[PDB]
Amino acid sequence: SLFNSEEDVVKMSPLPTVENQFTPTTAWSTSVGSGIGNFYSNLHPALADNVVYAADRAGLVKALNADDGKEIWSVSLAEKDGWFSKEPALLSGGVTVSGGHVYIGSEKAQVYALNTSDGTVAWQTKVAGEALSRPVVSDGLVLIHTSNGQLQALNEADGAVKWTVNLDMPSLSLRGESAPTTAFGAAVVGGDNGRVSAVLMEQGQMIWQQRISQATSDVDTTPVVVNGVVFALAYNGNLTALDLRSGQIMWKRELGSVNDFIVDGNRIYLVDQNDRVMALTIDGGVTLWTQSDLLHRLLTSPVLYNGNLVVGDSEGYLHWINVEDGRFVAQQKVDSSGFQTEPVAADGKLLIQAKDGTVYSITR
């Protein structure tokens, strides 16, 4: 391809000049070892009962006071196998917190449950594949969607596998975030070679299955359930709405190349593969706005916080976007190792973890 080769397609001058309409600040930051470095990861902080739990790839896990960032505990899941030199745990999926346990998945097909109290290992279970998605907890069970297309349910108390459902044999879904979603005692799992499935939580019985993509970059295929509708993103950029009750397709938009989406009220917020942001009406029918100034800056998934859509980028900036017209309302240089994993909005807090592992609490 002579023409593509002869172009210096290069360089961007992103960093739109934004006149900040408020002053976003760091309430606190706390280091977490070396973070994920240059490895791709879905590891992000979790917040519960005023405690932020965060981890790094090597195996460090910290419990921090949500108000000041002070360490409540810290343990390492890195292990030394007899005579052999200590090895990183390669934590990848999580963190997730639920009823006294911190659940984390690993690239070594390990799932760990830690006690929120003191950080001691409640249990550890060998899982059917790499756990690169966040564990999802529902009625006594820890749902793990592995990278090799398996959906396993573990007993939250002892980690024993209750059931396994082979959803597809790839491999190995390019570590797109593909956690299950829950609703009415069911799990809805996407990803999987273009199919969305709903299975019963009890014994993993297939309730319905719907092809949203023709069979065949890291797309977040986690379905989002909202008032009886399932919003699912296929790997090929198709956004689809499905009736939760029956799995019947309501509508479909061939967006071509979407990395992430969230849904909220009457809007769907999308970030495309090239870091363009867009908002659509709930039915995906009308384009409300687009924002093109962040092209190629490699954005995190967006989060809705304090009325704004917030995304971080690889250069270490946070950008705050008016959800009405997609204009920037604030821009902030936070950490120069950059952002990659999702920002988290919980109980009034905005947490985000840089690549070097430093966790920030950001106030708007």
Swiss-Prot record:
Can you supply a Gene Ontology BP term from the record?
Answer: Gram-negative-bacterium-type cell outer membrane assembly
- Please report the record's description of how this protein sits within the membrane: Lipid-anchor
GO terms for CC?
Answer: Bam protein complex; cell outer membrane; membrane
Alphabetized, the UniProt keywords read: Cell outer membrane, Lipoprotein, Membrane, Palmitate, Signal
The record's section on NCBIfam families has:
assembly_YfgL (TIGR03300), PRK11138.1 (NF008351)
Q: Hey, which family's this protein in? A: Belongs to the BamB family.
What is this protein identified as? Outer membrane protein assembly factor BamB
Task: Please tell me the species this chain comes from.
Answer: Escherichia coli (strain K12)
User: Gene name on record?
Assistant: bamB
